[PDB]
Amino acid sequence: IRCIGVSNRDFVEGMSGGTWVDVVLEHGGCVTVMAQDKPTVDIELVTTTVSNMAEVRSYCYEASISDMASDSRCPTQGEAYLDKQSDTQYVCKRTLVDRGWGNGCGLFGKGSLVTCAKFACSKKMTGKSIQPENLEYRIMLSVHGSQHDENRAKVEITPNSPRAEATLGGFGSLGLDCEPFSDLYYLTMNNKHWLVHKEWFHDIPLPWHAGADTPHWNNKEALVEFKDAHAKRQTVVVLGSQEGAVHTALAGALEAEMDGAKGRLSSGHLKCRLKMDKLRLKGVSYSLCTAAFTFTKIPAETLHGTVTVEVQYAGTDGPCKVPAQMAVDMQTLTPVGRLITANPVITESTENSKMMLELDPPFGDSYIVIGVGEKKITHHWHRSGGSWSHPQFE
Amino acid sequence: IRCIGVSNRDFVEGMSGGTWVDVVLEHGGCVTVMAQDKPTVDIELVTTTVSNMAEVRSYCYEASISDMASDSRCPTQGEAYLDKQSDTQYVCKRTLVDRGWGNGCGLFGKGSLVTCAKFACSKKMTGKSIQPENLEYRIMLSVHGSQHDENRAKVEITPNSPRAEATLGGFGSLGLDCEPFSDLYYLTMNNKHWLVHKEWFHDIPLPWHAGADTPHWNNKEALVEFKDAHAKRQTVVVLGSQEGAVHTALAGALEAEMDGAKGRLSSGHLKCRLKMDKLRLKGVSYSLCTAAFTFTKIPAETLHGTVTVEVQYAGTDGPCKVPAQMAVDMQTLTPVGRLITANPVITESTENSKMMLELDPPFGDSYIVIGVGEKKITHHWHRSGGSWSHPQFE
Amino acid sequence: EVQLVESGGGLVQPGGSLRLSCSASGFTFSTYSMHWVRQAPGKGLEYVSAITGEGDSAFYADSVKGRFTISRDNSKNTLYFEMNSLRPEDTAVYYCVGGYSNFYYYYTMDVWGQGTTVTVS
């Protein structure tokens, strides 16, 4: 069954005669919803996907230079010029260099000097805008502990369809009213994805290119180092890969995954309202399971203090009510604690069918009691309704 | 001639009858040494090279992972084990994961989990120890303004040979006594070299390998990210290239060059002592240049306020003394200022030979006077001995 | 229908190499852990290798450890088995097994390939 093994598991109880139940859905989390005379339901958020995202800005984190050229003038002959100064693909810088008789000038003193290089981007990171209108939440709704699908439903929630109705066979129907970023971008850097704040992403000190789309880079000087060697010559060297520095600057930032055109979100929470009104209990008109039950394995405690029990039923008596409870004294068999797998029913009309049960035992000593009469099975339990009523067989 | 065009140029004056002159030699710098009745000498530090350096430590700045494996145990079954835990090539991490009926365990709760990956270094930076005993300084010594080598000497200074003697032909000999790091390393990262402090280099948060040379890396965890995804699984991803982050962390650090086995230093200074004792003036026994001088181009001011003059001498009269000075009044021709190209002599016995002169003019108005009598050449000069004496020709 | 169609089997020399393929259809490939099971002539079934759905973790039995390599391409919906340094003991019918998994290599229900024969002489 669902939720039993989950560490991040929530237990929500709906009021008697109530219609709505408030639920908060986390990634890798389960919510077990219980209600008086209603079946216990499991609600889990499977996936959160953002699709059709528009590119807002690209940043160069690894670059390469080529086609280097230089120009210089004599001390009073004005500023140095290169055709590459007008080319957007070229990164250029103007300085002053020592000129004189020894290097082709009639005068001594500082002369203008320009250096140019063709900038090429080797690797880039992209930032995409998250549209709240293109979000897709995939929720799983299950009847907690129904026999082995009819009793489970996969629903898709979107701003276009924030209201969904799930049919759970003989357990009726369940309604979901949910509320599916205003300052977040979707960052992609070499198959690694992140959710970053608009302000931080805008201030990145790397060569950039805004919008869609050879290309033309702005602030190419961020990955290109222009050095002045003792006022004798100007050198140009590319800085190298910044992905590691960007990674460290992304300390504590939210991660993400890919699906080709859709981006899977690994974090966030979804607030919902559950319409319990149409949920119904299965087997209110059934007879009680008369044959013997046997434990297929020893009962085990979950991470939340509850007890999971697997039983095999020897009977062939169609769909019947499973007698299951906990008692502190074996004489009067007064019910203690409660059943999470509320009002359990066997659906199989064939022998030795299996059933999974979940009980919420009281604190201290108690017994797990499955079945009725002499053929009933017991197991002592130590910690730290939902049970079908029946006549006295003892 | 040397030093005239150099911006970082020093002028040092030696006392009359003096033996030693203290000099500090910088990279891309010139020192013009002047002394009474001695030839003017140019001293320049050409190269500083450190050879035969022993490797002290290698740091991985870009890595790659492969051969990923995992192992897990059930809640009470103890710690997870992999053979890769004992392998030095493998980076491993132990954690706790949710275990239960749904994933192969009889009990629910946290179970031990280990994850391993084969670490491979793609790119590395090396740190080498600078031995003071393996330093080599190459110094250039020139006679400042001698005619067009005999009057120049290339000397090599090492801790093995910190004393050197340079022969300058007819200008005698010159002695050099110099003093050729205790907390510095030679860093190499993808053809780029640096001089870094021992303390900083030792604290680098990257996978390392000490000494010579499967290889075996320590602190592989610095480039490998082990993530825990909602206590359900452990992921392993390599961080990527750190060269950019290392580059930025090397803010203000000294740079360097290569020669295959030798490392060129672009910074530092060399303190020396010059033995002026054996230096002699050329042409004290020569006659005066009787023929006419002509300016080959207009005199030019250097970056240090001095004046450079190029003259052509029409005479065929062998080696003679060049009449050159500055005067404020053309009548008495009393010498003002001084000559940097002290006691100039023509060596060529062939006509129209060329000579370069350097004068230190007084402040304000003065005249450059080359030659004697009616055939002498003049040029007016405005700013902001070393002259051969001769009889009156005026 | 859920299917696993394998290939790559053939006759090889001792110390030789071979690559097995296993094409998948009728299900989301990434949600299934993939395994290799072999049967030598006259012997029983032997579990030899496994890979997680994302292909980020691999398992090898001591019998094939070091020589054989398991891999997968989720965009191509195919499972691979690179076999190097083949010994006469490696002669067997090799089956690819798949099962829906949400925890590493664990599965309950499964799907088997038709089987491909590898011969070492």
Added chain:
Amino acid sequence: EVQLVESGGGLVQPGGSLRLSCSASGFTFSTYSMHWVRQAPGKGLEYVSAITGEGDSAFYADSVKGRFTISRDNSKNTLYFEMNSLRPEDTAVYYCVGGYSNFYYYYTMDVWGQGTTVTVS
């Protein structure tokens, strides 16, 4: 003795490619700026290209700009001239010129190669 031995010349078609080489000996190659000078039949000498000693900066005359590429390998002591999109106007004897330089492309004294003939028909 200081020498420049060139090669790579030959007969080529219009729009074709050719690569000229110029091997250097008798001097430290990195201390010399290298230049290409050409002479078309019946015409004078034409300065077309230049490269600094370290090979970090290159110059091209408007006549060869875009089509021709100058490069050097200081470990191999050789100068190169990649000529693409050759026109009949490019038919000339090509000379490599070298001169000791301590400032970009400037030189006083020089050394010339024997010359290599490039023909475009």
Added chain:
Amino acid sequence: EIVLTQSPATLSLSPGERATLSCRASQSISTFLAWYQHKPGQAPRLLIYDASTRATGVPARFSGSRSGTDFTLTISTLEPEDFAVYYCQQRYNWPPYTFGQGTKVEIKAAA
């Protein structure tokens, strides 16, 4: 290293008879045990998982049972299509998910 021991090696029976196949685990593996049917020229087919859960399309005559580390597969009434080799497979915790040596269910010869 978990070892599964199947018994008997060969079970010679007539159609209509009950086939009881055993599998003993070398250590406690809870209920993480599966049963396979293997016919010649065909791949193995999963019959039972979680020691007693019948797989999709597996007929009612096939049943799995367990007592501690001892596992049993019962074929209540053998049909002609049931004569094959049967394997047990352990799926406890982490791989290797080892198999038993197999039990051959063969047609009984006449007297």
Added chain:
Amino acid sequence: EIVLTQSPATLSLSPGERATLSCRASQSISTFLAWYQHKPGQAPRLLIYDASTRATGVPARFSGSRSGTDFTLTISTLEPEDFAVYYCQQRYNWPPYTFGQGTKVEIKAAA
């Protein structure tokens, strides 16, 4: 763009005679002017640099002179080996280090 204009186009002289070759720069280039000798089947040979400095092994009969933007190469007494094409080359500031069109110094025909 610096332009060098050489004159005359052809100089027809006898051996022993004085050859005066001219080169005018389109703008002031100080003394950054070189002179070359070019014989057939040979590469050009540098004669003079810095307008008046004779290169290594260049004989005394070759001399360079200058008056503003006007440059002169004088071959005081022509020797048989001096009949060739002569070029001037400007080396002012930055490339292109352009050449003049050339002057052919040819042997004079008999009357």
